[PDB]
Amino acid sequence: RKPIKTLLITGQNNHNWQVSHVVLKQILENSGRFDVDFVISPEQGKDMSGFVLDFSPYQLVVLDYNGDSWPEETNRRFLEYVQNGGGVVIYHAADNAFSKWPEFNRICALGGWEGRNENSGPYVYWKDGKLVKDSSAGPGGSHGRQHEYVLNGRDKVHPVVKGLPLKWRHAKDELYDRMRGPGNIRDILYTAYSDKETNGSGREEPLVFTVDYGNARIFHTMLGHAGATTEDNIAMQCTGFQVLLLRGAEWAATGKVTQKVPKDFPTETTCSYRKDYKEN
Numbered sequence: 001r002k003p004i005k006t007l008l009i010t011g012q013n014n015h016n017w018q019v020s021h022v023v024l025k026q027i028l029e030n031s032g033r034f035d036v037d038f039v040i041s042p043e044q045g046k047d048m049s050g051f052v053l054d055f056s057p058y059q060l061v062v063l064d065y066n067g068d069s070w071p072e073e074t075n076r077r078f079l080e081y082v083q084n085g086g087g088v089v090i091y092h093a094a095d096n097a098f099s100k101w102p103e104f105n106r107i108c109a110l111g112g113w114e115g116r117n118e119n120s121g122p123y124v125y126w127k128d129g130k131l132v133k134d135s136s137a138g139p140g141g142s143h144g145r146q147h148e149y150v151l152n153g154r155d156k157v158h159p160v161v162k163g164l165p166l167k168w169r170h171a172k173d174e175l176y177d178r179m180r181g182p183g184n185i186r187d188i189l190y191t192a193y194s195d196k197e198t199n200g201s202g203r204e205e206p207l208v209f210t211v212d213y214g215n216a217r218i219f220h221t222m223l224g225h226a227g228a229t230t231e232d233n234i235a236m237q238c239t240g241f242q243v244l245l246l247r248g249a250e251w252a253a254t255g256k257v258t259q260k261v262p263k264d265f266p267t268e269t270t271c272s273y274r275k276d277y278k279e280n
């Protein structure tokens with residue numbers, strides 16, 4: 001089969017996007033299943049009027065961006081792409097972007113920072129065997145110290161998770177917690193316990209899920225805080241991070257996952273890595 005034509009939007013981010021955009025392209029392209037094109041925006045505070053994107057050649061859009069609003073024509077074309085059954089991957093702090101764009105916050109379902117709070121929408125978390133909405137006052141977006149943590153599968157059937165272990169240890173990373181937004185989650189794939197003694201929330205927080213937005217296939221992964229270099233980048237070098245990105249990207253583009261469960265998938269107790277961003 002022909003590789004999946006992918007557009008990766010970057011150029012502004014409070015995170016080290018210079019590292020993450022390169023690594024995201026390598027993870028996807030090293031599988032031989034994706035052909036990735038970068039679009040790099042002007043820097044923060046520069047004229048954005050020329051950052052006019054064409055979504056028509058692509059089956060998948062990967063967001064690695066936060067900061068200045070894209071120009072109105074790009075915003076209109078992005079919404080048209082999504083509403084026409086487009087595939088989207090929301091990666092880590094891309095869900096912080098465009099706090100004042102209602103449509104964008106519905107595409108992410110949950111976001112954080114950029115002044116979000118109870119005015120941004122409810123908390124959504126796992127409580128006593130299901131997702132619950134909680135509109136109580138509080139901050140929109142937090143995380144504790146970076147740490148290894150165990151992801152809990154909440155879906156056994158979804159193409160992205162089918163065949164993967166129910167529990168697996170993710171490499172040292174931030175654990176996003178107290179995220180807020182319209183909360184229109186379609187399928188919850190993975191949650192993790194955010195321990196208060198790691199400066200967490202105390203809740204079982206959603207970290208990997210799909211979003212209910214018309215006929216769009218939206219894969220949201222809050223994992224993968226970018227390291228300072230492509231070599232020292234533990235959260236993204238995690239095999240779990242990479243396998244979920246590859247499967248989520250394939251699913252978002254085509255509605256299906258044709259990738260077998262790899263032999264190097266992490267266990268509940270032991271992290272696994274692909275330091276060079278390839279299954280060898």
Ligand SMILES: [Zn+2]
Pocket residue numbers: 015092093174225226
């Ligand atoms: Zn981060």
